[PDB]
Amino acid sequence: QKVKLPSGIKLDVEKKDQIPEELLKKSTTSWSTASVRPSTLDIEPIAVKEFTEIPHAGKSYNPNNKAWSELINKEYKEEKAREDERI
Amino acid sequence: PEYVRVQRQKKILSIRLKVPPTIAQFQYTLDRNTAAETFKLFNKYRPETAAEKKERLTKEAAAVAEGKSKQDASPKPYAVKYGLNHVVALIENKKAKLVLIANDVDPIELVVFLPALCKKMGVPYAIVKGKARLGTLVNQKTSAVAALTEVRA
Amino acid sequence: MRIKKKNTRGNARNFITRSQAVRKLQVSLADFRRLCIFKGIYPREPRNKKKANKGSTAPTTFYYAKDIQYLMHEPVLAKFREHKTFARKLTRALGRGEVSSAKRLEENRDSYTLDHIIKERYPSFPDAIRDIDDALNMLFLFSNLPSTNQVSSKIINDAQKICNQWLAYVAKERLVRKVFVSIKGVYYQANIKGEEVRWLVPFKFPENIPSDVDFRIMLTFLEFYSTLLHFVLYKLYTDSGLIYPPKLDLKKDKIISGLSSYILESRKYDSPVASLFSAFVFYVSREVPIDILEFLILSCGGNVISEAAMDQIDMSKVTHQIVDRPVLKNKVAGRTYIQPQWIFDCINKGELVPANKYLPGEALPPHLSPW
Amino acid sequence: GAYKYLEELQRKKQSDVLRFLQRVRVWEYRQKNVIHRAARPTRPDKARRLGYKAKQGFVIYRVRVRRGNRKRPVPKGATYGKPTNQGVNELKYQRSLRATAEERVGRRAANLRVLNSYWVNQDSTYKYFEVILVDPQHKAIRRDARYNWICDPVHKHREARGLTATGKKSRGINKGHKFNNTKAGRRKTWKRQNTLSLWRYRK
Amino acid sequence: AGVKAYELRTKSKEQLASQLVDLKKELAELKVQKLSRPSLPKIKTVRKSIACVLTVINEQQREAVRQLYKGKKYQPKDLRAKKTRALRRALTKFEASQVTEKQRKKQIAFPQRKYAIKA
RNA sequence: GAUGGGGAAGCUCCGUUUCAAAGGCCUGAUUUUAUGCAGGCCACCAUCGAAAGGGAAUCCGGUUAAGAUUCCGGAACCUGG
RNA sequence: GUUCUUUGUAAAGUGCCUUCGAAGAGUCGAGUUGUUUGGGAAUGCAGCUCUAAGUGGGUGGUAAAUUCCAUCUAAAGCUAA
RNA sequence: GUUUGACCUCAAAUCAGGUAGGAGUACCCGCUGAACUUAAGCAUAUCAAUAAGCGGAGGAAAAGAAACCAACCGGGAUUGCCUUAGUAACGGCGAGUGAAGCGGCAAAAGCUCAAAUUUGAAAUCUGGUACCUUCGGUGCCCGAGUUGUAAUUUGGAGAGGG
């Protein structure tokens, strides 16, 4: 049952009580190798845009007309702004 | 850098000086098409590698102890002869059908005698281009000379 | 202390640029981008940029210096260096030739794997079952699309097997609560031990590689999520408690290649959707999509026979016949005839609707998402 | 073998083949540093007989030394003494240049021990020597009984005490009537024969 | 007076740390008394008690460290034998009893025979 | 006055930016070879050498057997984040 | 002294016959300069110029040539008292 | 092929592991090197191949199995003592300087490369790593090495063939 130290000297052991607590915690060699995962990894990535994973339900196949019309009407406003800016 | 300067100038230094005739017989050499045909022949006669050698030792123990033989069950080995001292020794017997001599080699004095020695004995020698090429066929980095003494029917 | 100099401290310390990261790691940019997905270190905005970059206003990617100091160790990073040598020593073997030494070098090597980096990033099972949502989309994406350069077959044939494992667990253990067909494929929803998991299977249609999109990112994400879903499927199978990984019958696989292949084996349900369609036998026709129907009929426990299977080569016990043609001829008096809309509408309520509605060649009630 | 062809050909130094090599090589060596590491022997045959072996922990080192006489370092060319001291440039130095070459690489490469040295080329200013050194810490040397003797700490700095081939010539150690003043040591036999022995019962 | 070594070896590592801090507090209490007094004989024992505890903590640590480095080439230089410098250099029994293959045959064929002059 | 170098049997001597590969910055789906670094930019030189040269920023009042532009009270300024 | 393994048609020595029997170069040697010795016409060492042979080479304490005889086998190395 | 790849030489790492310096210095191995002094006052000489200066070692060092001494009915690695001897020899053949062979004893011990094809198999070796009986051993894997590592052979001999 092996263990890596901070120093990285690979050694086979039986019973992980047998190794002392000071040796695994503190540094014997100059180039010690982690242990502690930082705070700054655990925070989330920054929301650019808003992605909505739930679909619109106009996009259904066999939709109801009140939804399907409201799907077209909202993106027609997106498009016609760009066509105005184009012309 | 100094090392780059010196190696370029050394090359230049050789060409500007008149060179003695025994040297610079080298640099006249086997052509690419003839050289290509030479290597076909030699690669078929590649020597047994270290991995194969290990395998061959295990196979002989299984056969030889149980039935018979002095390792004589194993067939004849045909391969090229790479050591300079060995090939010079092969010449003068004289057993060697072809000798290939690399054009390069840092001592130079090492191989200057070999063209003349081959002529006197009457071995059919050649001066193939590059020592690293000779190395490849014989599983060495560089081989200096390579001679083929025997041949399949 | 003396006067202290400016661009050492603060924002200037906290962040570093991708140039500086890739330099300090000494990795190169191809393989820096991979490690930042395995870890994963994500890019940042500093609030005051002109402090951070000396003081360019200029478009830049910053990273947190501490995140790259944690990356600097990391026993994957060694196996990237070990590969770099292995490639160099293979080129020598070929470039002497000397082939069998390269054939040895092929065998004697140890490919990196992410197992430590999974179980530190997600400790553990409710945390992973949170994010496994994001994995399932891309595996079902990459399972469908056709093999090329920039992809190769083995990556896709991994993803097919890893997904067809996931379907068979959900079909056996019966967790399909919301269904929603769309134009963009089919969304499902499944309540795998507490948290609910939405995921999108595309329709099986032969399309299409744009060649704007970078695969040399997305294959690393796929390689990460393939190993993630291995460790989840290992746990889910044994806790159920079936054997992992499940063996697959070949002569079955040569009929359809899908969910009816794979067979699951050992060492009443949460209701009400599971044990719909019990004592209930479907004969699905040729025209309909087998790949999204058999899944829902097995995962809401009932029996299927397909027309699509028959071409390889009973109708005794069959109750229902799913078909969606304009005209149909001739129909049997005992059998019920419906359109696959019925199956999608039944599951979302979990009532069983009347089959007087629907039926060919009639017009429909609409569909409605459950969201 | 290479042996006889190389040995014989090396002796013909003023042959046209060898002098071309001599002229080309001296220029090459002069561009490089005074002491520097040589990748292999220039003369494989000559190193082999002096006891180079092509295995790990056998080192060759090329070195350059100024020709000519030993100047005394008195200031302003001034004697301060009798006119027996004579001209200052005509003092000669009792060790060779070959031996001075072994000492300089000995001080550079202190972990190694100097086995031998062989002459390679010369020029009006500079002689050139290729020195052959052995590493006694390397385990190929320490194992195998033919070269473990050099690991023993009596053989620290052979060159400095003058136990190399060049040094034993310079001290003047051979057998016979010619070498009476120096045989067991020059200062030893001096100290022996210029000392009054006196026994208890006086002879 | 004060602590004994044979007692401390049986105690665990967490107990020895608590033992040391208790003695160090008790030392600091005594040095406040010492400046008021001429003389304070108890202070000699408690400083030697501190030294006894530190020695036992070190000796427990090192013997554990020897056992996890046991049975492998290379180990820390303090754990290697000191000897003297020249004996640290210079040939081991294997690198010395080692003899060339010609010499090995010659000793088998012709060793130093045992004999005596009389009859 | 080290280093790179060069002298000297040698203790060491010359030389100080010199006949040195003398580091640290930007960009990168460098677009295909599908798990290996590519394309560029910049240009002299270790260190020591001033309690009187150069140099960020503090004043008043109080206080001690013996201390203060350094403690106490109040009122200021400087540097970096 | 006791006790366990035996390795081995393995390794090493010995007689007679018959072809081979390889052996160290800017070295040896000589000239000149300085030094050194009891070494004397040059004992040893060093620099600089010249520089060999293989039935050869060195030495044989008086100068050379001619012809003999004797004696060792250099220019690589280890080793207790 | 305006590409990819073999080698050669030369670099760089807080790369893996080693090692050198300084002290002591009576004795030992080298280098360098005076003068006082003694000779009539002295430039040969002598003091002295000495003191001071510098380099390098060990319990001893150095020396060592003859390119020796001899001219005998020849001896037989090296060192030391007694003797050879105040002799041969050197020197204003002045002052002075000054060996060696044999002989008797103390102690005694011999050997190794280079150079000859293993060519029916580089048979050789460092390192890493996994186990073990750990001054080390076995297996697997990177390398060194044919511009030559092992075995056989050192002139007393010897090798191959019978």
Swiss-Prot record, chain B:
Keywords per UniProt: Cytoplasm, Ribonucleoprotein, Ribosomal protein
Predominant cellular place of this UniProt entry's protein: cytoplasm
Keyword Ligase in the entry? The reply is no
A GO BP entry is:
cytoplasmic translation
Query: Could you tell me where this protein is found in the cell?
Result: Cytoplasm
Recall the GO molecular function terms of this protein's record.
RNA binding; structural constituent of ribosome
Q: Which GO terms describe its cellular component?
A: cytosol; cytosolic large ribosomal subunit
Q: How does it assemble?
A: Component of the large ribosomal subunit (LSU). Mature yeast ribosomes consist of a small (40S) and a large (60S) subunit. The 40S small subunit contains 1 molecule of ribosomal RNA (18S rRNA) and 33 different proteins (encoded by 57 genes). The large 60S subunit contains 3 rRNA molecules (25S, 5.8S and 5S rRNA) and 46 different proteins (encoded by 81 genes).
Q: Which family does it belong to?
A: Belongs to the eukaryotic ribosomal protein eL8 family.
Mention any additional remark. Present with 238000 molecules/cell in log phase SD medium. There are 2 genes for eL8 in yeast.
Functional note: Component of the ribosome, a large ribonucleoprotein complex responsible for the synthesis of proteins in the cell. The small ribosomal subunit (SSU) binds messenger RNAs (mRNAs) and translates the encoded message by selecting cognate aminoacyl-transfer RNA (tRNA) molecules. The large subunit (LSU) contains the ribosomal catalytic site termed the peptidyl transferase center (PTC), which catalyzes the formation of peptide bonds, thereby polymerizing the amino acids delivered by tRNAs into a polypeptide chain.
Task: Please give the name of this protein.
Answer: Large ribosomal subunit protein eL8A
The gene name reads: RPL8A
UniProtKB/Swiss-Prot annotation, chain C:
Q: Name one GO cellular component term.
A: PeBoW complex
Q: Name one GO biological process term.
A: maturation of 5.8S rRNA from tricistronic rRNA transcript (SSU-rRNA, 5.8S rRNA, LSU-rRNA)
All copies of domain BRCT, residue ranges? 272-360
Where does this one sit in the cell?
Answer: Nucleus, Nucleolus; Nucleus, Nucleoplasm
This entry's comment on induction and repression of expression is:
Expression is down-regulated prior to the diauxic shift.
Tell me the first and last residues of the signal peptide: none
* Keyword line: Coiled coil, Nucleus, Phosphoprotein, Ribosome biogenesis, rRNA processing
- Region entry Sufficient for interaction with ERB1, spans: 51-371
Recall the GO molecular function terms of this protein's record. large ribosomal subunit rRNA binding; mRNA binding; ribonucleoprotein complex binding; RNA binding; rRNA binding
Q: What happens when the gene is disrupted?
A: Essential gene. Reduced assembly of 60S ribosomes and accumulation of halfmer polyribosomes.
Q: Which domain of life is it from?
A: Eukaryota
Q: What does this protein do?
A: Component of the NOP7 complex, which is required for maturation of the 25S and 5.8S ribosomal RNAs and formation of the 60S ribosome.
Comment field (misc): Present with 4530 molecules/cell in log phase SD medium.
| Summary of subunit composition and partner proteins | Component of the NOP7 complex, composed of ERB1, NOP7 and YTM1. The complex is held together by ERB1, which interacts with NOP7 via its N-terminal domain and with YTM1 via a high-affinity interaction between the seven-bladed beta-propeller domains of the 2 proteins. The NOP7 complex associates with the 66S pre-ribosome. Also interacts with NOG1. May also associate with the origin recognition complex (ORC complex).
Q: What does the sequence similarity comment in the record state about its family?
A: Belongs to the pescadillo family.
Q: What is this protein called?
A: Pescadillo homolog
State which gene encodes it: NOP7
Query: Which part of the complete protein is shown?
Result: 1 to 460 of 605
UniProtKB/Swiss-Prot annotation, chain D:
Chief localisation class: cytoplasm
What terms describe the molecular function in GO for this protein? RNA binding; structural constituent of ribosome
Establish whether keyword Transcription is in the entry: no
Q: Name one GO cellular component term.
A: cytosolic large ribosomal subunit
> Which ranges form a coiled coil?
none
- For region Disordered, the annotated ranges are 163-184
Q: Name one GO biological process term.
A: cytoplasmic translation
Its keywords, alphabetically, are: Cytoplasm, Ribonucleoprotein, Ribosomal protein
Q: Which Pfam families match?
A: Ribosomal_L15e
Per UniProt, the ranges with Basic residues bias are 168-184
Q: Where in the cell is it found?
A: Cytoplasm
Q: What function does the entry list?
A: Component of the ribosome, a large ribonucleoprotein complex responsible for the synthesis of proteins in the cell. The small ribosomal subunit (SSU) binds messenger RNAs (mRNAs) and translates the encoded message by selecting cognate aminoacyl-transfer RNA (tRNA) molecules. The large subunit (LSU) contains the ribosomal catalytic site termed the peptidyl transferase center (PTC), which catalyzes the formation of peptide bonds, thereby polymerizing the amino acids delivered by tRNAs into a polypeptide chain.
Family of the protein in this entry: Belongs to the eukaryotic ribosomal protein eL15 family.
Q: Tell me how this protein assembles.
A: Component of the large ribosomal subunit (LSU). Mature yeast ribosomes consist of a small (40S) and a large (60S) subunit. The 40S small subunit contains 1 molecule of ribosomal RNA (18S rRNA) and 33 different proteins (encoded by 57 genes). The large 60S subunit contains 3 rRNA molecules (25S, 5.8S and 5S rRNA) and 46 different proteins (encoded by 81 genes).
Anything further noted? Answer: There are 2 genes for eL15 in yeast.
What is the name attached to this protein's record? Large ribosomal subunit protein eL15A
UniProtKB/Swiss-Prot annotation, chain E:
Looking at the UniProt record for this protein, which Gene Ontology cellular component terms does it annotate, in alphabetical order? Answer: cytosol; cytosolic large ribosomal subunit; preribosome, large subunit precursor
Q: What is this protein called?
A: Large ribosomal subunit protein uL29A
Q: Name one Pfam family in it.
A: Ribosomal_L29
What assembly does the database describe for this protein? Component of the large ribosomal subunit (LSU). Mature yeast ribosomes consist of a small (40S) and a large (60S) subunit. The 40S small subunit contains 1 molecule of ribosomal RNA (18S rRNA) and 33 different proteins (encoded by 57 genes). The large 60S subunit contains 3 rRNA molecules (25S, 5.8S and 5S rRNA) and 46 different proteins (encoded by 81 genes). uL29 is associated with the polypeptide exit tunnel.
The protein's matches in PROSITE patterns, at most eight in alphabetical order, are given as: RIBOSOMAL_L29
- Print the organism lineage: Eukaryota, Fungi, Dikarya, Ascomycota, Saccharomycotina
- CDD domains listed in its UniProt record: Ribosomal_L29_HIP
The further comment given in this record reads: There are 2 genes for uL29 in yeast.
- Which keywords does this chain's UniProt record carry? Cytoplasm, Phosphoprotein, Ribonucleoprotein, Ribosomal protein
